[PDB]
Design a protein around this motif. Structure first.
Motif, PDB file in Angstrom:
ATOM      1  N   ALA A  10       3.965 -63.519 105.438  1.00  0.00           N
ATOM      2  CA  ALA A  10       2.816 -62.260 105.841  1.00  0.00           C
ATOM      3  C   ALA A  10       3.481 -61.072 105.342  1.00  0.00           C
ATOM      4  N   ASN A  11       4.511 -60.892 105.665  1.00  0.00           N
ATOM      5  CA  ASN A  11       5.329 -59.480 105.519  1.00  0.00           C
ATOM      6  C   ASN A  11       6.091 -59.457 104.246  1.00  0.00           C
ATOM      7  N   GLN A  12       6.261 -60.430 103.528  1.00  0.00           N
ATOM      8  CA  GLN A  12       6.621 -60.321 102.152  1.00  0.00           C
ATOM      9  C   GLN A  12       5.937 -59.433 100.920  1.00  0.00           C
ATOM     10  N   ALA A  13       6.582 -58.672 100.063  1.00  0.00           N
ATOM     11  CA  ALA A  13       5.646 -57.746  99.304  1.00  0.00           C
ATOM     12  C   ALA A  13       5.585 -58.448  97.886  1.00  0.00           C
ATOM     13  N   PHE A  14       4.305 -58.640  97.229  1.00  0.00           N
ATOM     14  CA  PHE A  14       4.144 -58.946  95.859  1.00  0.00           C
ATOM     15  C   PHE A  14       3.707 -58.151  95.055  1.00  0.00           C
ATOM     16  N   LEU A  15       3.553 -58.036  93.997  1.00  0.00           N
ATOM     17  CA  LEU A  15       2.914 -57.619  92.882  1.00  0.00           C
ATOM     18  C   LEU A  15       1.044 -57.697  93.403  1.00  0.00           C
ATOM     19  N   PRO A  16       0.395 -56.650  93.545  1.00  0.00           N
ATOM     20  CA  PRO A  16      -1.086 -56.977  93.976  1.00  0.00           C
ATOM     21  C   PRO A  16      -1.813 -57.547  92.778  1.00  0.00           C
ATOM     22  N   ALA A  17      -1.366 -57.299  91.487  1.00  0.00           N
ATOM     23  CA  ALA A  17      -2.097 -57.925  90.215  1.00  0.00           C
ATOM     24  C   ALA A  17      -3.729 -57.234  90.390  1.00  0.00           C
ATOM     25  N   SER A  18      -4.520 -58.254  90.149  1.00  0.00           N
ATOM     26  CA  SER A  18      -5.983 -57.868  90.223  1.00  0.00           C
ATOM     27  C   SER A  18      -6.646 -57.404  91.663  1.00  0.00           C
ATOM     28  N   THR A  19      -5.767 -57.522  92.954  1.00  0.00           N
ATOM     29  CA  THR A  19      -6.419 -57.029  94.022  1.00  0.00           C
ATOM     30  C   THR A  19      -6.339 -55.689  94.019  1.00  0.00           C
ATOM     31  N   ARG A  38       3.601 -61.876  85.674  1.00  0.00           N
ATOM     32  CA  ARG A  38       4.544 -61.325  84.752  1.00  0.00           C
ATOM     33  C   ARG A  38       5.928 -61.205  85.693  1.00  0.00           C
ATOM     34  N   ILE A  39       5.941 -61.247  86.860  1.00  0.00           N
ATOM     35  CA  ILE A  39       7.230 -61.429  87.583  1.00  0.00           C
ATOM     36  C   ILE A  39       7.422 -62.407  88.394  1.00  0.00           C
ATOM     37  N   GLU A  40       8.437 -63.366  88.617  1.00  0.00           N
ATOM     38  CA  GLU A  40       8.484 -64.410  89.452  1.00  0.00           C
ATOM     39  C   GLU A  40       8.417 -63.887  90.783  1.00  0.00           C
ATOM     40  N   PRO A  41       7.966 -64.382  91.890  1.00  0.00           N
ATOM     41  CA  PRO A  41       7.455 -66.010  91.797  1.00  0.00           C
ATOM     42  C   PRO A  41       5.794 -65.557  91.484  1.00  0.00           C
ATOM     43  N   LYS A  42       5.267 -66.401  90.452  1.00  0.00           N
ATOM     44  CA  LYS A  42       3.896 -66.326  90.146  1.00  0.00           C
ATOM     45  C   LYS A  42       3.025 -66.772  91.256  1.00  0.00           C
ATOM     46  N   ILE A  43       1.964 -65.716  91.632  1.00  0.00           N
ATOM     47  CA  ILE A  43       0.976 -66.064  92.766  1.00  0.00           C
ATOM     48  C   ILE A  43      -0.337 -65.914  92.549  1.00  0.00           C
ATOM     49  N   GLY A  44      -1.013 -66.422  93.269  1.00  0.00           N
ATOM     50  CA  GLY A  44      -2.418 -66.195  93.313  1.00  0.00           C
ATOM     51  C   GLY A  44      -2.618 -65.424  94.978  1.00  0.00           C
ATOM     52  N   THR A  78       0.975 -72.566  87.681  1.00  0.00           N
ATOM     53  CA  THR A  78      -0.136 -72.813  86.500  1.00  0.00           C
ATOM     54  C   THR A  78      -1.489 -72.411  86.992  1.00  0.00           C
ATOM     55  N   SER A  79      -2.151 -72.105  86.064  1.00  0.00           N
ATOM     56  CA  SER A  79      -3.563 -71.508  86.227  1.00  0.00           C
ATOM     57  C   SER A  79      -4.429 -72.613  86.942  1.00  0.00           C
ATOM     58  N   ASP A  80      -4.032 -73.958  86.833  1.00  0.00           N
ATOM     59  CA  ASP A  80      -4.668 -75.087  87.203  1.00  0.00           C
ATOM     60  C   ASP A  80      -5.126 -74.858  88.713  1.00  0.00           C
ATOM     61  N   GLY A  81      -4.220 -74.300  89.661  1.00  0.00           N
ATOM     62  CA  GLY A  81      -4.449 -74.217  90.951  1.00  0.00           C
ATOM     63  C   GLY A  81      -5.267 -72.922  91.419  1.00  0.00           C
ATOM     64  N   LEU A  82      -5.818 -72.339  90.455  1.00  0.00           N
ATOM     65  CA  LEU A  82      -6.387 -70.924  90.950  1.00  0.00           C
ATOM     66  C   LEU A  82      -7.592 -71.186  92.001  1.00  0.00           C
ATOM     67  N   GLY A  83      -8.503 -72.413  91.894  1.00  0.00           N
ATOM     68  CA  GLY A  83      -9.489 -72.384  92.617  1.00  0.00           C
ATOM     69  C   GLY A  83      -8.992 -72.732  94.251  1.00  0.00           C
ATOM     70  N   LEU A  84      -7.699 -72.976  94.225  1.00  0.00           N
ATOM     71  CA  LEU A  84      -7.306 -73.209  95.726  1.00  0.00           C
ATOM     72  C   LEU A  84      -7.065 -71.894  96.651  1.00  0.00           C
ATOM     73  N   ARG A  85      -6.818 -70.759  95.900  1.00  0.00           N
ATOM     74  CA  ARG A  85      -7.059 -69.526  96.514  1.00  0.00           C
ATOM     75  C   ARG A  85      -8.182 -69.697  97.721  1.00  0.00           C
TER      76      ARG A  85
END
Ligand SMILES: CN(C)c1cccc(-c2cccc(C(=O)O)c2)c1
Ligand SMILES: [Cl-]
Length: 242
Positions: free
Chosen positions: A39-48, A191-197, A220-227
């Protein structure tokens, strides 16, 4: 205060997934998560990042209102919904990166940096290219930091006009029925690991609001609906939605 509920881990492992959900009960000022560390680990925000980017573009007049048309630049891209004209509503709905890259170029480095500090947004670091740093630059934000930012937006407490905040909350509208309203934004970082949604936002009820922020591994993009699916399973378990 904060409470860790590892029983929610089932919602990820049952889908061969790993991630975190963070919930915040506004009336009770209490938070809940399955994994305090993540919950406190920082990731790229991407489209958020389209939430703060929209706010800044509106407040500076780069975007006049939610009806202004951003014409397709005529370059065919691999996301079909991107190859057309958009306004702020549809650009948010379809996470149309090239529209928001143009926003950022018009905002510029100096104003973007100042505004993200004013928002207390993530690590406030725009190192990288001004038109892509939220995809492959230095900016990072955690799930708990997303909630902190969203609460300010909900209460119109961010350092932009009330109008700009109302418009962005309109553009965040995702679902509404007789039981609840969800205003939220998806993200997908590759674009940077780990890939996340990502999925961040809130659920409006008659007499309370529940803020949420989740991210999960996305090989992979197959799991995007799991978000959305995992988040709603948690909301249902906690009887926030039917
Ligand atoms: C090659 N890229 C850019 C790529 C690949 C797969 C899916 C998307 C995409 C497009 C629109 C929205 C979303 C999302 O956040 O649901 C995700 C983008
Ligand atoms: Cl609305």
């Amino acid at each position: 205060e904060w409470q860790e509920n590892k029983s929610w881990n089932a919602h990820f492992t049952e889908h061969k997934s790993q991630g975190v959900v963070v919930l915040w009960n506004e009336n009770k000022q209490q938070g809940f998560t399955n994994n305090l560390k993540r919950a406190n680990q920082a990731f790229l925000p991407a489209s958020t990042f389209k939430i703060p980017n929209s706010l800044i573009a509106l407040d500076l007049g780069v975007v006049k209102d939610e009806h202004q048309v951003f014409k397709w630049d005529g370059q065919t891209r691999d996301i079909a919904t991107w190859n057309r004209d958009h306004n702020l509503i549809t650009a948010m709905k379809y996470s149309v990166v090239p529209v928001y890259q143009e926003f950022a170029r018009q905002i510029g480095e100096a104003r973007m940096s100042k505004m993200l500090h004013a928002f207390d947004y993530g690590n406030e670091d725009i190192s990288g290219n001004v038109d892509s740093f939220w995809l492959d630059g230095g900016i990072r934000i955690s799930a708990t930091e997303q909630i902190s930012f969203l609460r300010k937006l909900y209460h119109n407490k961010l350092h932009v006009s009330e109008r700009s905040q109302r418009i962005v909350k309109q553009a965040m509208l995702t679902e509404a029925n007789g039981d609840y309203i969800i205003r939220a934004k998806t993200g997908y970082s590759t674009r940077i690991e780990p890939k996340i949604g990502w999925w961040v936002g809130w659920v409006e009820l008659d007499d309370n609001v529940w803020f949420f922020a989740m991210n999960m591994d996305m090989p992979t993009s197959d799991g995007l609906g799991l978000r959305q699916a995992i988040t709603k399973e948690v909301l249902k378990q906690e009887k926030i939605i039917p």
